[PDB]
Write an enzyme that holds these catalytic residues in place. Structure first.
Site, PDB file in Angstrom:
ATOM      1  NE  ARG A 177       7.017   3.240  31.000  1.00 24.73           N
ATOM      2  CZ  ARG A 177       6.977   1.963  30.634  1.00 24.73           C
ATOM      3  NH1 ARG A 177       7.909   1.427  29.857  1.00 24.73           N
ATOM      4  NH2 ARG A 177       5.970   1.213  31.048  1.00 24.73           N
ATOM      5  CB  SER A 196       4.316  -1.940  28.986  1.00 34.61           C
ATOM      6  OG  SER A 196       5.144  -1.400  29.999  1.00 34.61           O
ATOM      7  CG  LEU A 197       7.600   1.865  24.856  1.00 38.05           C
ATOM      8  CD1 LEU A 197       6.888   1.933  23.496  1.00 38.05           C
ATOM      9  CD2 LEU A 197       7.832   3.276  25.463  1.00 38.05           C
ATOM     10  CD  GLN A 229       2.495   1.710  31.584  1.00 40.72           C
ATOM     11  OE1 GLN A 229       2.195   1.763  30.382  1.00 40.72           O
ATOM     12  NE2 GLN A 229       3.435   2.501  32.126  1.00 40.72           N
ATOM     13  CG  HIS A 286       4.530  -4.288  33.699  1.00 40.64           C
ATOM     14  ND1 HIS A 286       4.164  -2.963  33.637  1.00 40.64           N
ATOM     15  CD2 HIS A 286       5.059  -4.590  32.492  1.00 40.64           C
ATOM     16  CE1 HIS A 286       4.461  -2.481  32.446  1.00 40.64           C
ATOM     17  NE2 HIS A 286       5.010  -3.446  31.733  1.00 40.64           N
ATOM     18  CD  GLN A 322      12.545  -3.647  25.972  1.00 34.91           C
ATOM     19  OE1 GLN A 322      12.320  -2.479  26.318  1.00 34.91           O
ATOM     20  NE2 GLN A 322      13.698  -4.019  25.392  1.00 34.91           N
TER      21      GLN A 322
END
Length: 308
Positions: A116, A91-92, A249, A200, A10
């Site tokens: 997600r 992340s992604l 995560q 997160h 992101q």
């Protein structure tokens, strides 16, 4: 080889992303066509026409970013590009890396990251969360400012992007307090991110629980390229291991600084950012100055990288 592939998350999306690469290689729009068939809408059109406000909705940003990274991966392979020694994602980005490394089916991944994004968006009531980028203050001081500012709420360092760049997240008011405390402790700045979801941190717990259900139904195969995860900073090969790291995560910090230090420790000399933008590229030298980095989203840059 002496290079690794790193995948952004992101923030790296933009209207018009990969436009020139698509003109260079038809496989880009074919990859997006595959995602569009799984999603039920024209993902490529969304990335090219926007508006930014729509592309920025996390349940659309995630498939857009995953698809974009997988497309560049496919271009790289098509031109004879060799395999990286290791892969890592922010992340992604970890999902991108897992698709490229052959662990997760692409269409599965496209559907998975869409969900997600949806789960993350519903984790907490609208407008109760926040994220802020703290600039120019050591990890210890930031942690201390967060503890002093929590007051029973959630506020933690969640993205360790580089020394001098740490994103914090949690309840909005706790994040506003923590930012102010960071500044008083010597931070050059506290900059709220444009996201509304506190990624997160503990508040993502419910989203992670729902994601783990959906992840349990997706066939995970053996990786053909090693992937270091950002939650534990290590390489896993067992499906259950990879899955749990993906679940954890979501509500645990992205240790990007440690992941890059780990990549350098393996003897990798260069990081290629496989996605739109140059976010990860920029963090590299701040983390380990013996590394070099470059992005693979411009035609001339990708062409040059193949030649060596």
């Amino acid at each position: 080889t002496q290079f690794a592939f790193v995948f952004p998350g992101q923030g790296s999306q933009s209207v018009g992303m990969l436009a020139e690469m698509a003109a260079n290689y038809p496989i880009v729009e074919e990859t997006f066509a595959e995602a569009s068939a799984a999603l039920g809408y024209d993902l490529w059109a969304l990335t090219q026409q926007g508006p930014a406000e729509e592309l920025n909705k996390t349940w659309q940003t995630q498939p857009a970013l995953l698809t974009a990274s997988v497309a560049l991966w496919r271009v790289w392979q098509q031109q004879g590009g060799k395999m990286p020694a290791l892969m890592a994602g922010h992340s992604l980005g970890e999902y991108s890396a897992l698709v490229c490394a052959g662990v997760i089916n692409f269409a599965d991944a496209v559907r998975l990251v869409e969900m997600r994004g949806k789960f993350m968006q519903e984790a907490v009531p609208e407008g109760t969360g926040g994220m802020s980028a703290i600039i120019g203050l050591d990890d210890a001081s930031i942690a201390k400012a967060c503890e002093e500012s929590a007051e029973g709420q959630v506020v933690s360092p969640v993205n360790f992007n580089s020394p001098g760049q740490v994103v914090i997240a949690g309840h909005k008011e706790a994040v506003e307090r923590a930012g102010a405390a960071c500044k008083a402790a010597g931070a050059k700045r506290a900059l709220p991110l444009p996201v509304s979801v506190p990624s997160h941190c503990a508040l993502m717990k419910p989203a992670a629980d729902k994601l783990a259900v959906e992840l349990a139904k997706i066939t995970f195969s053996a990786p053909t390229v090693p992937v270091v995860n950002n939650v534990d900073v290590k390489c896993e090969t067992d499906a259950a291991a990879i899955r749990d790291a993906l679940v954890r995560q979501l509500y645990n910090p992205v240790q990007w600084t440690k992941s890059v230090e780990f990549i350098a420790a393996q003897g990798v000399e260069h990081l290629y950012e496989v996605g739109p933008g140059k976010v990860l590229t920029g963090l590299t030298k701040r983390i380990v100055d013996t590394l070099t980095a470059s992005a693979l989203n411009e035609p001339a840059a990708l062409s040059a990288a193949l030649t060596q």
